[model samples]
Target: GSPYLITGIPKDPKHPLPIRKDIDDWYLEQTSAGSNRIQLTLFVEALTVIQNRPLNDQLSYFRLAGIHGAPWTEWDGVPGGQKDSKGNPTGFCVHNNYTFPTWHRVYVTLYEQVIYEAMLDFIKQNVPQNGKADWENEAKQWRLPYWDFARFARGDELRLPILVTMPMVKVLVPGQPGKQLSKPNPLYRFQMQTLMGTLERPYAITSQKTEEHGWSFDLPFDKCQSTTKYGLLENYNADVWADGGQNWLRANLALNEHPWYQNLDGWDSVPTLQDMTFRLLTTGGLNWGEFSSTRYDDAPKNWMNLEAIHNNVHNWVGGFMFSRPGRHDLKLWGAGHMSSVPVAAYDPIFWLHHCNIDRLTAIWQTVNSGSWFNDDKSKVSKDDDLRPFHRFCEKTRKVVFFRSDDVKDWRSLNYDYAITKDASRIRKEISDLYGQRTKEVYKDFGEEDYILSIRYSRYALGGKPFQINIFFGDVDGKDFYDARSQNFVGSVFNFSGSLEDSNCDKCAVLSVSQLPARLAVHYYKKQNKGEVPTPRYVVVNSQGKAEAEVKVEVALHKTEGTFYDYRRVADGKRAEVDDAYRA
Candidate 1:
C-alpha cells in the first residue's frame, strides 16, 4: 500500500491553523478557566482514536514513530531512488546538524494536521445536536498543545505534568460543566498494541541489511505493552520493589539510581530545565552553527544551544532503568522511550517535546532575526532537503521535498505560538525566571557571573550518553551517588549518538568531534560575596559510573540586554593576596 499523502488541506486567508498553546496554559484554560471543555475532550479523544488505529495504517502511531530513526526504512517515497555518495538508500531524518530544527519543524506540522482532521471527525459524531455548531467551532480552532518542558507548572516544581504522568484524566462534561468524566490520558505513554518487527540494538551487532553501520536500536519486546520513565526517586523506593514485582524491576528504576540522572539533576541540587532554557534565551549572540547543534565548533563561544538544551531534557525525562537491581553495566537497560532517538517518537511525549523545540525555534528566530543557517559554518545548508517531510506544490502539481527555507517562517505554515508570541515577552520571561538583579547594597562589589566550560568528545564512551557534573565541594560514595551537596553547581551532558565504529560515516567524522557545554554558576557568586568559586567536575558514564574527576575552564561574563560579553578567567586556587581589581 502507498504511504498516506497529506494533500491539499486548503489554506484559508480568513482562517489559519489555530495557535499552539503551552500544555500548562492549555490545561488551565480548559480545566480551571471553565471554557473550551469540549475542545479539550475532543483533543484527548482524537489522539486516543488516532493512537488506537491499526499498525497497518501508514499514519498509525507506530509507523509515524518509525519515521524518525527506527525500523530503518524510507518514508513517503522520500529520498526515493536517491543514492548516497556510496549508492546506498539516502534516507531522511537529519540529526545533530543545522537541519535538525527544520526537519522536526515540518515533522511536527504533519502530526498537527493529522490530529486536526481527526478532531474534526469526532466533533461531528460526538457533539449533541444543539451544541453541534459550537462544538464544531471549538474543534476547528483546536491545535496540538506543546509541553514547555522548561517552564514550571503552577504547583509542580520541576515535576512532570499530571496530565503527562497520570494514567487517567478527569475533564468536565461537554454539555454540563458541573459534571466530570474520566478517560485514559492520551499524553501518557503510548501503548504498543501491535507486534513490532525485529530491528538491531544500538550497541549490538545485527544481520539486518538496512542498518549498514549497525547503529540502529531494537526495543526489547515484539509487542511492548507500554512505556515508562525513571521518574522521581521517591515514587519508587526499595520497599515498593520488595514484593519481588518483576514488573517494577523491569519498568521502574529509581531516578537517582541512574548515573546520568545523578550527574544531570544532582539529586535536585543542580539547575532546573527552566534555568538552562533561560540561559540559552539570554545568550542570544549565537550564530547558526552554535545555535544549531552540539557538534564541536570553536566558533561557539558558549554551548547553551538549542540542540544541547534539547539533549539534556531527553536524558532527564528518559533516565535509564536497569532490569535488575545490580545491573550496573550499560549493555542492558530500558530507556523511557524519550532517551533513545531511534525509539523516542514511539512514546507520545516525543510530539509534545518536539513541539516545544519548534516553539523555542520560533522564539529564537524572533529574538535574533536574520540569524539563520550559515552555509559556510554549519555542516548542512538551508537548501538541504528535510527528507520525508514534503509539501504538495499547487503550481508544480507535484509533491515537492521541503528544505529548511520552506518552513523558516512558522506563520507561513498557518500557526503561531501562544504566550511566547513576541521577542520582548520571551526575554521578559527569561528575566523573571533566571535573570540576576544588581542589588543597591552591592554598589562597589566586584560580583560577576561565571560559566563553567566543558569540552568533551560526543563519542567518548563509544557513543553512549554521559554527563560531566560540576561541584564547588568534594564528593563521596561509589556507583550510587548524590550531587545534592551544597557545593553542587550544574552538569553538562554529551547526549550520545547511535553510531558505532564501523559503517557510520557521520559518526566517524564527528567521532573525535569535541562538544562544548557551558553551565552558568548561579549560586556561588551570591554566597561567596565577590570571591571566585573554584569548580570541579565528575565525569559519569552511561552506566552511572563516576569515571573521572577533573577541573574545567571558567569565564566571567556580563549580561547586556539579551546578549553577553565574556573574558576567560584563571580557575586557579583563590589566593589570600590576589591582585586588587576595580572597573
Candidate 2:
C-alpha cells in the first residue's frame, strides 16, 4: 500500500546524506509533464474536496487527519460528549500524551493512503497507457515523502523549509523545452477553503499565508513583552482574517524573509555521535521515556520518550503568529497552524513534518528492535485500541480498521523506506561506540557550568521586547519576589521587535557560573568548591510596569563532553552524530 522505503529527502544532498546515491528529486517536483507533479496535484485537489465535508464524518479527510481534541466531538463510536454552548465540538489532537507521536503517524498514513487511492482513481478514469499494462502498480511505488527538518536545525543558523515559502514554481512543460509554466505550488501552501464550516473565511490558505520563519533566544520567554513574546519568529498583524488579506500576508512574509536565513535551511549538524550512540546503545531502547509521559515535564529531554522531542518539533515549525490583544498566549501568538494543534493538519506541511517524525523513529526501531513501549498506562499501548487504519476488501469491500496493536511496526502496513542506509549508518556508528547499554561506562564527573533554556507563553509577549534575567542557587533569595539576588546568573539582551517564534532558542541560554564546577565529591571536599544548584524567574523589565513571577519554562542542561574523556574530534571527530547534547 506504500513505498517499501520512504527515502530520506534532504534539502541539500551533500551534508550527512542517508545514502550515497541521493534521490536529488525533492517532493517539490512540479514539472508540467511528470509523474510526481501529476500525483501531487491530484492528491492536493482530492484532499481539499475531502476537507470540505463534515469534520466528524469518518470518510472526511479532516476527521481522518484530526482536529483539536476540544471543538471536536468524542471520536467514540457511540459519541455522547457535550458540545460547546454554541454547539461546536472540542479539539482532540493527541498532545502532551504518550500516544501523541504515533497517533499523528497514523493520521499522516491515513491521508497518504487516501491520496494513493485518489491517484489510482485518477489513473483509471483519466489516463490509459501501455495498452492494458498495470499503472496503479507503478503508482503504488510512490509514497508520502517526509519534510526532514530535524537534520536541518542547527540553532541560530536555522531557516524554514525552502518549498513552503515558494508561491509559484516554474516547471518545464512537456513538449515545450525552454518554455516554462508558473503554477500555483501545492507544496507552498494548502489552500484553506471553507474548513470546519469557517465559511466566512473561505480563503483559509491566503496568498498572505507564509512558511518563511526562524527564531533566536530573547528576554527569558515569559518576560519578553512589548516587541516580542517567548522571543518568537515574526509578529503577525492581527488584522488578517481566515480568508486572507494583503497586510496580513506581508506581515507573515516579514517573519520568514530575514537575511539571517540565506541558505542554511537546507543544512546543519546535531547530536554528537557519542551522546546519540550512548542514548541508543546504552539505555532503554525506545522504551519508558519517549512514549510514556502523561505530561511533557515528566519526560522533558529524556531520550527514552519520543513524544517530548516530537512536541518540540511542533513548536519549532509552528513559530509565532498574529495575536489577539487580550486573549491567552496561544490565542495571542500561537498563530502558525503548525504551532497550535487544533487546525495544524489543515496545513499541508503537517503531513510532511510527521513523515520525518515517524520515519526517524522507524530508524530508531530498526537500529534496536528491543523494548518498544506500546502499553504502559502512559495512556498508550498496543491493546489500547485505535481507529481508521484503512479498512478495505477489494472483493467484499468490508473494512477492518487499525487497532493500536496493528501499527506497532511500519512494515506491518507493508511499507518500508527506499533507503535502509540511513538507519544502518547511524546504528553502525552509535552501536560501534557503545555496544550494549547494559554495562555502565564511566565519564569524568567534572564540575560543569549550568545553562538555562527558558520558553515563554505566547501571551506574555507583545510588540515590545523587554529586559529579563535568570538567577540560580540562592534559595533564600528564591522566588521572583526580587530581581536583586546574590545568585543572579545573566541578563538577556534588549529586544525591540522580533522573538515571536518560540520554537528555536526562544529563550536564551545563560551560563550561571563564571567558573565551572566539578561534580565528584572528591573535588568538592578537597577545594571547598560549593555551587548553588537552584533557580528562579522574574520579569524585571516591562512596557509599562516591572513584575516578577511571569510564568514561563526553564530547562537546565550541562555542557556535553564535560571531562577530558575518550570521545573523538573533528565535527570534532564523532561530535556530529547528534550534536544537540553530548555529556
Candidate 3:
C-alpha cells in the first residue's frame, strides 16, 4: 500500500528536512502554507481518537499498555490481559536487564507501523478522489514524532513542542468540498467529567478514564507538594473555578521557576538529573551503553546501571506532572502515573517519549565507544561480542536471539532514525550540549566541579522493594544518616524484574552527580569554616529489611569526557575503579 514502508516521515517534502536540533520549524510551518501543519495536526487527531478507542485496534491505547505491564506468561489476564490471566507465548519486553535498548527499538518501530497504518486509514475514509493521492502521499511521509525533551531543560522556554500544549489544533476538513476546517483539542489535559475507580492504584484509574472521567492519574505517593500524598496538582481539574484536576501543562512548565524542587539547579532551573542523563549517555562503561546492562541470559556478565536517562526520563515526565502550591515547592516530590509500567502506555505521550529514548539509545551506541555491540558481519556467527546479536521480530512474537552482530544496525529493525550514521557524531553533539552546560557553570563559579560515577550490586536493587537514596557530599556516616546533601543525586525506586531471575546483579552504573556547584559556591562564601566536603557516597538502607538487603562494595571514578576501555564499563566490580576508591 505504501512505498516508503518504514523510512518514517520524510523530514519535509516541500522544504529540505531541518537540522535534528531545530525546534523552530514547527513554528514557521504554522504561519506558512500550513499544508504541512494541517497534515501533522490531522495525524495527531487520528492518534488521539485511536488512543481513546477500545482494545484490539491498531494504535489503541490498551493494546500497547498490555505489553508494558504484562509477561509473556500473563497476557490474557483480566482487564489488562489477553486470555483470562496468561500472556502471549512469544513476545515479551526485557527490563531490569539488557536487551532493553534493542527490544524497544523493535517495539517502538512496531508502534510506528501502528501509527502509520492508522494514518493510512484516516486518509481512506475522508479524502475524495480528486487529490486523495496527494494527501495520502503526505500521510505516508508522516513518520513517528519525537519530543526532544532535553529541550525542556535546555531552552528557557518551558513550552516545548509548543503545539502539544495548545487546546486545539487547526486542520483542514476531510471532504474536498471547499476544504473547510476543524479543531480537535489534543487532550493534553483529558477533561475530567467524574472520577470513578478503586482509586487504589494506577490500574483503577485507566478503567475510570475509559468509563467515567477523562484521563486522570491520581496515583498517590507517601510525602507531597500539597495534596493527598507527596505530589499534588491541586485544582488541576479545570472549568471556571475548578483548576486543579489535571493541569498537565502547568505542572511541567512550572519547573523553570521553582526554587526548592531539588531538581533545583542551574539558571533558576533544574538540569542536575537531566544533565546526568546526558552525560551517561555520552560517557562509556556505564553498561548502560549496551544490552548486557540488564539480563540477557545468552550474554556474559554486564555491569552497574543508573536510572540514567532511561528511568530518569520516566520519572521526569511523571514528576513534571506534579505542580507546586503557590510560589512554594512540594516538600516531597510526586512520581506521576506515567512512571508506572502497566498504566504508562495508556498515556499517549509515552509513545513519543519512547521514540526519543530509542533515538538516544542509538546515539549512545556511537558515544559508548567499543562498549556497544560489535557490528562485524563475520563475527555475527561467533555470537561473541558485547551485545548478543538478536532480532526482536514483531511478527514471530519472539526475540530471535541471533548473532551479537545483527542487532547493531537499525536497518535490520526495518527503520532508520537520524539521517547521520556516525554514533560518534551524535555523541559529540550531545556531549557538546553537556559541555556547554558545564562551561556555563564554570564560567560563573570560576571553580572546577567533579563528575562522579558510582556502582552498586543489583542485589541492592530489589525491583525497588524499598527506596535507596544515594546522596553526595558530607554525611554523618551513621546508620540511617539524616545529614545529607540537599540534592538527592539519585534514587533506586523501581527494579522491574528480579536480579536473581536475570541471573544478574543490578549495578547503579551512572554518573552519580556533579557536586552542585551552587553548594560549592555557597561553601566558599561562608568563608573558611568547613573544608570542601570530599565526594562521599552514603547509602541509606532500610531497617533490617532482609528482603531488600544486598550488601556491596562501591567504586568511584572521575574523568573529563573520559571513555574507558570496553573491558568492563558496567561490568560490576570487574570494572577498573580509579585508585581513589581502591583504599
- Residues 374-446 of candidate 2 have per-residue lDDT tens digits of 3353434444333323444346665544444456566545455544444547655444433322112223234
Every candidate's lDDT: 0.55, 0.38, 0.40
TM per prediction? 0.76, 0.55, 0.63
RMSD of each candidate?
Answer: 8.2, 13.6, 9.9
lDDT of candidate 1 over 1-583, digit per residue (tens) = 4445443233644457468887777777887664757767877888888888765565666667767755545566643223333333322456666777888888888888788778777767766678777777776676777877665446124444446766788765655747878988877777643324322332111223454543333323233345545421222343332121112222222221222322443322223455456666666567766777665444224566788777766766665432323323432333455666656676677898889899888877878776888536674467875667667667879777777777878877778886455545767665654443212212233354444455556655544556665555334333222233335445565555443211246543331111211222333444467454565555654444555422233333333222325555534221111111100
Per-residue alpha-carbon lDDT of candidate 3 for residues 1-583, written as tens digits (9 for 90 to 100): 1112233333444533322222334435543753445456556667666666644332354445445642211222212322211111112444443455655655566566666666767777766777678877666555566666664433443333555455566566666433545565543433222331322233233321233311112343221111111133434332222212333453354322221223433433445444544554544544433333432222111233333345544544544223322232323233344554434554455666777667666666655646553433222323422121233456787644433345566555444455235443664667554445544544553333333333344334433322234433422222211112242333433333222222223352222212123333333334347433233343332221112234433332322332312121111122111222221
Number of the candidate with higher lDDT, 1 or 3: 1
Worst 10 residues of 3 by lDDT: 221-230
Which parts of model 3 have CA positions greater than 4 angstroms off? 1-35, 56-59, 70-91, 152-164, 176-270, 284-307, 320-332, 367-370, 374-407, 419-428, 431-434, 443-449, 454-530, 534-583
- The C-alpha local distance difference test score for the whole of candidate 3 amounts to 0.40
Question: Using lDDT as the measure, what is the rank order of every candidate, best first?
Answer: 1, 3, 2
Worst 10 residues of 1 by lDDT: 574-583
